[PDB]
Design a protein around this nucleic acid. Sequence first.
RNA 1: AAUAAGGAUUGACAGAUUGAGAGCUCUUUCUUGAUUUUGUGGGUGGUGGUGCAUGGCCGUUCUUAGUUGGUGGAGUGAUUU
Length: 115
Amino acid sequence: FKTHSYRGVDLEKLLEMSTEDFVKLAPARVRRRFARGMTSKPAGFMKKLRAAKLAAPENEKPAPVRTHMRNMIIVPEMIGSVVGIYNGKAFNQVEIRPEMLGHYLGEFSITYTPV
RNA sequence: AAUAAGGAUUGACAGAUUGAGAGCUCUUUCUUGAUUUUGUGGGUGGUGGUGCAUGGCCGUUCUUAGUUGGUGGAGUGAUUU
């Protein structure tokens, strides 16, 4: 068997890392997202991601958060977190990952039905 | 009018919860300070309806040739040229 090494760059540091770090390693868009309208995104999610990941027993998933920030990023410290999102009415949750990392949040939440 | 400075209430760490560094909740029990909270009375959020409740504008008869009135004059008069 051969684990998702995020850009092996050698999970190991893509498990539990800074916000300077992967600020750089995203694909062009995001440079112009951590650095633009930077403040006031997680005025209190990375501070309810850290109340969740953190009030569990771990391994029992944690007690669901709330959020309408479908405009946040997927970063290497929210790895596991649980997360639950406004499509305009209700909180659709999601498994949060190492291979969701660099990608858009609430792309994921699917809003509109299709057929 | 009721809670009643003996706290109306507010806020939060982080962790449980989730997209999440929303104290959304619950764990704690710090903070909080008459500005809130609760019902009663009522408002003002409304790209929710009704274009046939309507305003204003803009399409159409319209790169149209067409209206209307006095004084005469005509013709109960609806009037007429």
